[PDB]
């Protein structure tokens, strides 16, 4: 909407809100990120202090698929199967059927342990497990299963 | 130039629902400039057997 721009409220004002002393000239210190080490150094220090330099080792061809590992906390495990299934097997124990939460089927590979688990046995199947994730699962009466 | 615009689907469905609802209010329909003073019901529905012969 060009009728709501500031250009429609500065018609009649000579300089269009750019000043009479310091005009609206072509450049205001260079083009792009020019002068990052000479006259815009105070801007780069203030707002991007680690812009200039090197840090870390180069990876000549990065295989970003190897670092792909979605994670789910223990507190979010039961939401994969829903609260209806969770309440159905609320009084399960050793010996009878216990729901299996296949994280890989839902796109989660590693199970991290954060937050609390409802006090029901559960079988958690995933590729990797955190240390506290296995402790919290076992303390609730469940089991940890490996995949792939 | 950008000729066509985007709108989220659920916002379009929200707007359509609020437009079907407003068509069942005779005060809003008449205020839009429609002559509905003689219709029986403003949610006017006709039999499907009558439409089949038209």
């Amino acid at each position: 909407a060009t009728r709501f721009r500031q250009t429609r409220r500065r018609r009649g004002h000579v300089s269009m809100g750019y000043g009479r002393i310091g005009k609206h000239r072509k450049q205001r210190g260079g083009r792009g990120n020019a002068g990052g080490q000479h006259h815009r150094k105070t801007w780069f220090t203030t707002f991007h202090p680690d812009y200039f330099g090197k840090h870390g080792m180069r990876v000549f061809h990065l295989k970003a698929n190897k670092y792909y590992c979605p994670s789910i906390n223990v507190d979010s495990l039961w939401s994969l199967v829903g609260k209806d299934v969770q309440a159905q097997y609320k009084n399960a124990k050793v010996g009878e059927e216990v729901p299996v939460i296949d994280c890989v089927k839902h796109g989660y590979f590693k199970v991290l342990g954060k937050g609390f688990l409802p006090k029901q046995p559960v079988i958690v199947r995933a590729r990797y497990f955190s240390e506290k994730a296995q402790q919290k699962i076992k303390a609730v009466g469940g089991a940890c299963e490996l995949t792939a | 130039r950008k000729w066509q615009r985007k709108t989220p689907k659920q916002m379009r469905r929200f707007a359509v629902a609020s437009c079907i609802a407003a068509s069942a209010v005779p005060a809003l329909v008449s205020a839009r400039g429609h002559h509905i003073a003689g219709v029986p019901q403003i949610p006017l529905v006709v039999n499907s057997k009558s439409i089949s012969v038209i």
Binding site: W43, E96, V100, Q134, G141, E145 | -
Partner: protein, 232 residues
Amino acid sequence: MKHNQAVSNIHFCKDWRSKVHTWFKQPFRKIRRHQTRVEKAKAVFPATIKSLKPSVHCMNQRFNYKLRLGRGFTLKELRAAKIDKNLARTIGIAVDPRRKESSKECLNRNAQRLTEYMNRLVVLPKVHAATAKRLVLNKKNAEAKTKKAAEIKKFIAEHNKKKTKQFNKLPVQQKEAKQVLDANKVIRLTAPCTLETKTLTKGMKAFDAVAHLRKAKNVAKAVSGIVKGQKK
């Protein structure tokens, strides 16, 4: 630049105005392709099938739990399904001798796909006239096949209570033709998945998943020390 902003990285310093591609032909590609699809649906009528494709696993561990349509069945999958590789290309089956047999599970999964397709397949005679040899030979062996099918019915009756054909017969018969556009939409890649339930035992309860992960990791990093020690 003034105040707090990101460092701008815009690659417009070249001539982008001659590099601009506009999609004003998008609404008409849909019409052009759909119309060409319909004319493709005729001419080759029935079965404008996009060829039966195998069930293959997506590459890399990021995707390997998913199945997707490959390109062409391997020669072993056709041999296992008892299909001639020369006839396969003419009855709407994709063939790919470039693909190597990856696993037994792949061989069995994609041999079952061909078996299901061959049962759902109806091949019309090469000559429409009723005096064609295949229609003639169908009547000729119809008497003999009745006794041939007698023991096969009881073959699957007592046991279920290498002599295996090199090639199965093509299903050739005269029928009212119904056109399905794609056979990959009839034969699913995988069955729908429901909630899995398992019996909780003390054996699974005591399993230490983290310890096995660390041991597998530590054993992998310990092969370096073995080689250095052996050379010492």
